Design a protein around this ligand. Structure first.
Ligand code: HEC
Ligand code: HEC
Ligand SMILES: [Cl-]
Lengths: 131, 130
């Protein structure tokens, strides 16, 4: 019942893809008409996934593509697992702050907290995700 | 606006990531129970279940898009109101699971976990090609 390396890659990819979809809804609400309840729901996804323990999905054998299952994790990620962990914690904390800002229903607060989350996604990607 | 292929990929991602978190709750219920692990996993299930995934069932997502295959049954698209009702049953079961987990109510967590799983199953039985 332990996830295989292939399953760990697919599962982490699923979490990132689903965060990204919800981030996009927050961006859309900030740029246009603001639907506070939609932003709450989206922010809760980002907070929950960022705090779900995704480091468990970076086990041995998950550095390589597995047949048709390709990873964008760079070798640098597996060489620096402690720094990756720190960047993940920065996302967890920022994402919780985004969900708390969204709970207030105030677009301005969300705008700030959303910037801090996006910066945390980008900080990790710049170092550890292939383009 | 997401393309059809992106809607398929995104809904698949949501279900896959829920499933991983469901398995963590099951492991806590069958093994050494950790309330904080259960909170984190329950929060994912509740959040994903309430994230507006019906928006991922747009036109053109009833068929495979090149290499991107869907396992949704064609009947799903003939019954979208019911699909939404079943999604809503998941959302209210999952919020109950997360509320119980948040407050440390382990009996209610155990029972809500079974109701969540039943909601997954109810939709699959009708609407997933398996
Ligand atoms: C601490 C590191 C880290 C953080 C933080 C992080 N990512 Fe990533 N991201 C990755 C890695 C590594 C991959 C490649 C995963 C793979 O292919 O195995 C990835 C891949 C992705 C992908 C590629 C498609 C996919 O589904 O895999 C998207 C989209 C994505 N991330 C979005 C996000 C968003 C949005 C956030 C912030 C809300 C985020 N990521 C935060 C490390 C991170
Ligand atoms: C209201 C309908 C509905 C509910 C509720 C639902 N599912 Fe599904 N599920 C589907 C459909 C439809 C697919 C196929 C998606 C596709 O391939 O486009 C699917 C696919 C999946 C997949 C495969 C995703 C992949 O990787 O392709 C898993 C795993 C899954 N569901 C688990 C769950 C779990 C766990 C729950 C409950 C916590 C759940 N589902 C609730 C409709 C639902
Ligand atoms: Cl009716």
């Amino acid at each position: 019942a332990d996830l295989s390396p292939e399953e760990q890659i697919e599962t982490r990819q699923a979490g990132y893809a689903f965060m990204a979809w919800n981030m996009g809804k927050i961006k859309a609400n900030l740029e246009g008409e603001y639907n506070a309840d939609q932003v709450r729901a989206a922010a809760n996804v980002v907070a929950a996934i960022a705090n779900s323990g995704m480091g468990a999905l970076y086990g041995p054998g998950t550095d390589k593509n597995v047949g048709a299952v390709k990873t964008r994790a760079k070798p640098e990620l597996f060489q620096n697992l402690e720094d990756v962990g720190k960047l993940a914690r920065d996302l967890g904390t920022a994402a919780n702050a985004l969900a708390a800002a969204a709970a207030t229903g105030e677009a301005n607060a969300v705008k700030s907290a959303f910037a801090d989350v996006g910066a945390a996604c980008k900080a990790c990607h710049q170092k550890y995700r292939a383009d």
